[PDB]
Amino acid sequence: ALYTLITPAVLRTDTEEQILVEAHGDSTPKQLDIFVHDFPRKQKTLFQTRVDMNPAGGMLVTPTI
């Protein structure tokens, strides 16, 4: 019932960065995708992945974008 997303304020490039996807109150396990587009228009995806968020992991997932 509360999905949060925490990235660094200034994302470096050519660097394996960590973000933080979190779900407070939901426990139905999910498969959820992360897309990294550009700002002004939806351009080519700079990154694209898929990570799974299960309550055995604590309903938080830390992808490596």
mmCIF file of all heavy atoms in Angstrom, residues 17-44:
data_model
loop_
_atom_site.group_PDB
_atom_site.id
_atom_site.type_symbol
_atom_site.label_atom_id
_atom_site.label_comp_id
_atom_site.label_asym_id
_atom_site.label_seq_id
_atom_site.Cartn_x
_atom_site.Cartn_y
_atom_site.Cartn_z
ATOM 1 N N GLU A 17 25.338 1.623 -10.561
ATOM 2 C CA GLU A 17 24.684 2.348 -9.485
ATOM 3 C C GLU A 17 23.634 1.469 -8.829
ATOM 4 O O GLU A 17 23.167 0.489 -9.411
ATOM 5 C CB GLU A 17 24.028 3.632 -10.000
ATOM 6 C CG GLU A 17 25.006 4.672 -10.486
ATOM 7 C CD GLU A 17 25.620 5.466 -9.355
ATOM 8 O OE1 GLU A 17 25.104 5.393 -8.225
ATOM 9 O OE2 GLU A 17 26.623 6.167 -9.593
ATOM 10 N N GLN A 18 23.264 1.831 -7.605
ATOM 11 C CA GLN A 18 22.241 1.127 -6.849
ATOM 12 C C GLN A 18 21.049 2.038 -6.632
ATOM 13 O O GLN A 18 21.210 3.207 -6.276
ATOM 14 C CB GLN A 18 22.764 0.661 -5.495
ATOM 15 C CG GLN A 18 23.306 -0.747 -5.476
ATOM 16 C CD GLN A 18 23.215 -1.371 -4.103
ATOM 17 O OE1 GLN A 18 22.136 -1.475 -3.528
ATOM 18 N NE2 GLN A 18 24.354 -1.782 -3.563
ATOM 19 N N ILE A 19 19.852 1.500 -6.845
ATOM 20 C CA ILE A 19 18.621 2.191 -6.485
ATOM 21 C C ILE A 19 17.904 1.309 -5.475
ATOM 22 O O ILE A 19 18.410 0.250 -5.100
ATOM 23 C CB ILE A 19 17.744 2.491 -7.711
ATOM 24 C CG1 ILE A 19 17.217 1.207 -8.328
ATOM 25 C CG2 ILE A 19 18.530 3.245 -8.753
ATOM 26 C CD1 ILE A 19 16.095 1.429 -9.296
ATOM 27 N N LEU A 20 16.736 1.732 -5.010
ATOM 28 C CA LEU A 20 16.061 1.035 -3.917
ATOM 29 C C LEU A 20 14.560 1.080 -4.168
ATOM 30 O O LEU A 20 13.934 2.132 -4.036
ATOM 31 C CB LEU A 20 16.426 1.666 -2.581
ATOM 32 C CG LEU A 20 15.678 1.243 -1.324
ATOM 33 C CD1 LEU A 20 15.871 -0.224 -1.077
ATOM 34 C CD2 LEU A 20 16.178 2.031 -0.147
ATOM 35 N N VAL A 21 13.992 -0.058 -4.538
ATOM 36 C CA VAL A 21 12.557 -0.206 -4.739
ATOM 37 C C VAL A 21 11.991 -0.948 -3.539
ATOM 38 O O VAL A 21 12.494 -2.012 -3.167
ATOM 39 C CB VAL A 21 12.263 -0.952 -6.048
ATOM 40 C CG1 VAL A 21 10.794 -1.301 -6.163
ATOM 41 C CG2 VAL A 21 12.708 -0.117 -7.221
ATOM 42 N N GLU A 22 10.948 -0.397 -2.932
ATOM 43 C CA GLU A 22 10.464 -0.898 -1.659
ATOM 44 C C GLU A 22 8.944 -0.873 -1.653
ATOM 45 O O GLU A 22 8.338 -0.006 -2.280
ATOM 46 C CB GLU A 22 11.030 -0.049 -0.520
ATOM 47 C CG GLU A 22 10.784 -0.572 0.864
ATOM 48 C CD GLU A 22 11.761 -0.007 1.849
ATOM 49 O OE1 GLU A 22 12.371 1.028 1.523
ATOM 50 O OE2 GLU A 22 11.928 -0.593 2.940
ATOM 51 N N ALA A 23 8.334 -1.828 -0.957
ATOM 52 C CA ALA A 23 6.884 -1.929 -0.857
ATOM 53 C C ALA A 23 6.495 -2.137 0.596
ATOM 54 O O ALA A 23 6.801 -3.182 1.178
ATOM 55 C CB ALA A 23 6.361 -3.083 -1.709
ATOM 56 N N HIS A 24 5.808 -1.158 1.176
ATOM 57 C CA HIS A 24 5.350 -1.242 2.556
ATOM 58 C C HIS A 24 3.881 -1.632 2.588
ATOM 59 O O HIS A 24 3.026 -0.875 2.121
ATOM 60 C CB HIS A 24 5.540 0.088 3.284
ATOM 61 C CG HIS A 24 6.944 0.598 3.271
ATOM 62 N ND1 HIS A 24 7.876 0.229 4.213
ATOM 63 C CD2 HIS A 24 7.567 1.467 2.444
ATOM 64 C CE1 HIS A 24 9.018 0.840 3.959
ATOM 65 N NE2 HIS A 24 8.858 1.597 2.891
ATOM 66 N N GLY A 25 3.588 -2.797 3.152
ATOM 67 C CA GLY A 25 2.220 -3.224 3.331
ATOM 68 C C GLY A 25 1.712 -4.236 2.332
ATOM 69 O O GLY A 25 0.701 -4.893 2.607
ATOM 70 N N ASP A 26 2.369 -4.394 1.189
ATOM 71 C CA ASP A 26 1.993 -5.396 0.204
ATOM 72 C C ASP A 26 2.912 -6.597 0.354
ATOM 73 O O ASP A 26 4.114 -6.443 0.583
ATOM 74 C CB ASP A 26 2.083 -4.832 -1.218
ATOM 75 C CG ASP A 26 1.272 -5.636 -2.233
ATOM 76 O OD1 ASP A 26 0.948 -6.814 -1.977
ATOM 77 O OD2 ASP A 26 0.958 -5.080 -3.308
ATOM 78 N N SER A 27 2.342 -7.794 0.227
ATOM 79 C CA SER A 27 3.116 -9.021 0.345
ATOM 80 C C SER A 27 2.808 -10.021 -0.760
ATOM 81 O O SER A 27 3.303 -11.150 -0.706
ATOM 82 C CB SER A 27 2.895 -9.674 1.713
ATOM 83 O OG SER A 27 3.426 -8.870 2.752
ATOM 84 N N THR A 28 2.013 -9.650 -1.746
ATOM 85 C CA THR A 28 1.883 -10.484 -2.931
ATOM 86 C C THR A 28 3.140 -10.317 -3.774
ATOM 87 O O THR A 28 3.447 -9.194 -4.188
ATOM 88 C CB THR A 28 0.655 -10.093 -3.746
ATOM 89 O OG1 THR A 28 0.964 -8.949 -4.549
ATOM 90 C CG2 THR A 28 -0.514 -9.761 -2.830
ATOM 91 N N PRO A 29 3.898 -11.387 -4.025
ATOM 92 C CA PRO A 29 5.188 -11.239 -4.709
ATOM 93 C C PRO A 29 5.016 -10.809 -6.156
ATOM 94 O O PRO A 29 4.058 -11.192 -6.829
ATOM 95 C CB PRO A 29 5.805 -12.638 -4.614
ATOM 96 C CG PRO A 29 5.050 -13.317 -3.523
ATOM 97 C CD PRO A 29 3.666 -12.775 -3.606
ATOM 98 N N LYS A 30 5.950 -9.984 -6.618
ATOM 99 C CA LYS A 30 5.802 -9.275 -7.874
ATOM 100 C C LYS A 30 7.045 -9.448 -8.730
ATOM 101 O O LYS A 30 8.153 -9.624 -8.222
ATOM 102 C CB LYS A 30 5.554 -7.781 -7.638
ATOM 103 C CG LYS A 30 4.262 -7.461 -6.908
ATOM 104 C CD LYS A 30 4.325 -6.099 -6.243
ATOM 105 C CE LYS A 30 2.941 -5.516 -6.035
ATOM 106 N NZ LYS A 30 2.043 -6.430 -5.286
ATOM 107 N N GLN A 31 6.834 -9.407 -10.042
ATOM 108 C CA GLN A 31 7.899 -9.250 -11.023
ATOM 109 C C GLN A 31 7.717 -7.882 -11.653
ATOM 110 O O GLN A 31 6.665 -7.602 -12.234
ATOM 111 C CB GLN A 31 7.848 -10.340 -12.092
ATOM 112 C CG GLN A 31 7.796 -11.747 -11.552
ATOM 113 C CD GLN A 31 8.516 -12.723 -12.452
ATOM 114 O OE1 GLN A 31 9.369 -12.332 -13.250
ATOM 115 N NE2 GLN A 31 8.184 -14.002 -12.326
ATOM 116 N N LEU A 32 8.727 -7.032 -11.535
ATOM 117 C CA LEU A 32 8.565 -5.635 -11.905
ATOM 118 C C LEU A 32 9.793 -5.163 -12.664
ATOM 119 O O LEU A 32 10.920 -5.526 -12.321
ATOM 120 C CB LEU A 32 8.303 -4.759 -10.670
ATOM 121 C CG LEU A 32 9.366 -4.421 -9.627
ATOM 122 C CD1 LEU A 32 8.888 -3.227 -8.837
ATOM 123 C CD2 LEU A 32 9.645 -5.577 -8.690
ATOM 124 N N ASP A 33 9.563 -4.370 -13.702
ATOM 125 C CA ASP A 33 10.626 -3.990 -14.614
ATOM 126 C C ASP A 33 11.057 -2.559 -14.360
ATOM 127 O O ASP A 33 10.264 -1.725 -13.919
ATOM 128 C CB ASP A 33 10.156 -4.138 -16.055
ATOM 129 C CG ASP A 33 9.391 -5.422 -16.285
ATOM 130 O OD1 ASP A 33 10.029 -6.495 -16.305
ATOM 131 O OD2 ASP A 33 8.153 -5.360 -16.440
ATOM 132 N N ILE A 34 12.319 -2.274 -14.660
ATOM 133 C CA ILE A 34 12.912 -0.957 -14.472
ATOM 134 C C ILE A 34 13.424 -0.474 -15.819
ATOM 135 O O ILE A 34 14.184 -1.180 -16.489
ATOM 136 C CB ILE A 34 14.038 -0.978 -13.417
ATOM 137 C CG1 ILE A 34 13.465 -1.095 -12.005
ATOM 138 C CG2 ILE A 34 14.914 0.251 -13.511
ATOM 139 C CD1 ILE A 34 13.347 -2.487 -11.488
ATOM 140 N N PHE A 35 12.995 0.715 -16.217
ATOM 141 C CA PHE A 35 13.403 1.321 -17.472
ATOM 142 C C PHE A 35 14.111 2.631 -17.182
ATOM 143 O O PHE A 35 13.721 3.372 -16.274
ATOM 144 C CB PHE A 35 12.202 1.564 -18.391
ATOM 145 C CG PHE A 35 11.476 0.315 -18.764
ATOM 146 C CD1 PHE A 35 10.403 -0.129 -18.012
ATOM 147 C CD2 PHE A 35 11.872 -0.424 -19.861
ATOM 148 C CE1 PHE A 35 9.738 -1.287 -18.349
ATOM 149 C CE2 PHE A 35 11.211 -1.581 -20.204
ATOM 150 C CZ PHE A 35 10.143 -2.014 -19.447
ATOM 151 N N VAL A 36 15.162 2.903 -17.947
ATOM 152 C CA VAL A 36 15.953 4.117 -17.798
ATOM 153 C C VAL A 36 15.927 4.853 -19.131
ATOM 154 O O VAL A 36 16.750 4.595 -20.016
ATOM 155 C CB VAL A 36 17.387 3.775 -17.338
ATOM 156 C CG1 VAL A 36 18.207 4.999 -17.136
ATOM 157 C CG2 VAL A 36 17.363 3.012 -16.025
ATOM 158 N N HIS A 37 14.959 5.754 -19.298
ATOM 159 C CA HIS A 37 14.818 6.524 -20.529
ATOM 160 C C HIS A 37 15.597 7.824 -20.424
ATOM 161 O O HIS A 37 16.402 7.985 -19.507
ATOM 162 C CB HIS A 37 13.352 6.828 -20.823
ATOM 163 C CG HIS A 37 12.495 5.611 -20.957
ATOM 164 N ND1 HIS A 37 12.386 4.905 -22.133
ATOM 165 C CD2 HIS A 37 11.698 4.982 -20.064
ATOM 166 C CE1 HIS A 37 11.558 3.892 -21.959
ATOM 167 N NE2 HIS A 37 11.129 3.914 -20.711
ATOM 168 N N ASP A 38 15.375 8.754 -21.344
ATOM 169 C CA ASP A 38 15.916 10.100 -21.228
ATOM 170 C C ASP A 38 14.833 11.050 -20.734
ATOM 171 O O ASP A 38 13.665 10.680 -20.595
ATOM 172 C CB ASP A 38 16.498 10.578 -22.555
ATOM 173 C CG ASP A 38 17.529 9.631 -23.103
ATOM 174 O OD1 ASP A 38 17.982 8.760 -22.339
ATOM 175 O OD2 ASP A 38 17.914 9.775 -24.281
ATOM 176 N N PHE A 39 15.236 12.285 -20.457
ATOM 177 C CA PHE A 39 14.309 13.264 -19.900
ATOM 178 C C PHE A 39 13.240 13.768 -20.871
ATOM 179 O O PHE A 39 12.056 13.536 -20.596
ATOM 180 C CB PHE A 39 15.059 14.463 -19.320
ATOM 181 C CG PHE A 39 14.169 15.637 -19.021
ATOM 182 C CD1 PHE A 39 13.206 15.560 -18.022
ATOM 183 C CD2 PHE A 39 14.293 16.818 -19.738
ATOM 184 C CE1 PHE A 39 12.384 16.637 -17.751
ATOM 185 C CE2 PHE A 39 13.473 17.901 -19.469
ATOM 186 C CZ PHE A 39 12.519 17.810 -18.474
ATOM 187 N N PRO A 40 13.579 14.502 -21.995
ATOM 188 C CA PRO A 40 12.538 15.310 -22.652
ATOM 189 C C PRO A 40 11.477 14.487 -23.365
ATOM 190 O O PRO A 40 10.278 14.695 -23.156
ATOM 191 C CB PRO A 40 13.327 16.179 -23.642
ATOM 192 C CG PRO A 40 14.733 15.684 -23.627
ATOM 193 C CD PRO A 40 14.780 14.421 -22.856
ATOM 194 N N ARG A 41 11.907 13.546 -24.195
ATOM 195 C CA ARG A 41 10.997 12.599 -24.816
ATOM 196 C C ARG A 41 11.412 11.197 -24.410
ATOM 197 O O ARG A 41 12.546 10.992 -23.967
ATOM 198 C CB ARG A 41 11.003 12.756 -26.336
ATOM 199 C CG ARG A 41 12.391 12.765 -26.938
ATOM 200 C CD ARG A 41 12.359 13.147 -28.403
ATOM 201 N NE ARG A 41 13.687 13.076 -29.001
ATOM 202 C CZ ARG A 41 14.532 14.098 -29.059
ATOM 203 N NH1 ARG A 41 14.181 15.275 -28.564
ATOM 204 N NH2 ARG A 41 15.724 13.946 -29.616
ATOM 205 N N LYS A 42 10.504 10.235 -24.534
ATOM 206 C CA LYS A 42 10.866 8.849 -24.291
ATOM 207 C C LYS A 42 11.767 8.384 -25.422
ATOM 208 O O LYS A 42 11.297 8.065 -26.518
ATOM 209 C CB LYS A 42 9.618 7.970 -24.173
ATOM 210 C CG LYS A 42 9.906 6.492 -23.974
ATOM 211 C CD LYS A 42 8.720 5.630 -24.369
ATOM 212 C CE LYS A 42 7.620 5.676 -23.324
ATOM 213 N NZ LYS A 42 6.709 4.501 -23.442
ATOM 214 N N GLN A 43 13.066 8.372 -25.170
ATOM 215 C CA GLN A 43 14.051 7.957 -26.147
ATOM 216 C C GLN A 43 14.324 6.465 -25.986
ATOM 217 O O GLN A 43 13.527 5.739 -25.381
ATOM 218 C CB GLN A 43 15.309 8.817 -26.007
ATOM 219 C CG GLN A 43 15.232 10.129 -26.768
ATOM 220 C CD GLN A 43 14.867 9.930 -28.232
ATOM 221 O OE1 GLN A 43 13.724 10.146 -28.636
ATOM 222 N NE2 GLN A 43 15.839 9.500 -29.033
ATOM 223 N N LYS A 44 15.411 5.987 -26.585
ATOM 224 C CA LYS A 44 15.867 4.620 -26.384
ATOM 225 C C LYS A 44 16.182 4.366 -24.916
ATOM 226 O O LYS A 44 16.644 5.262 -24.201
ATOM 227 C CB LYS A 44 17.100 4.346 -27.250
ATOM 228 C CG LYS A 44 18.261 5.303 -27.026
ATOM 229 C CD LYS A 44 19.455 4.935 -27.890
ATOM 230 C CE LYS A 44 20.125 3.656 -27.412
ATOM 231 N NZ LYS A 44 20.826 3.833 -26.111
#
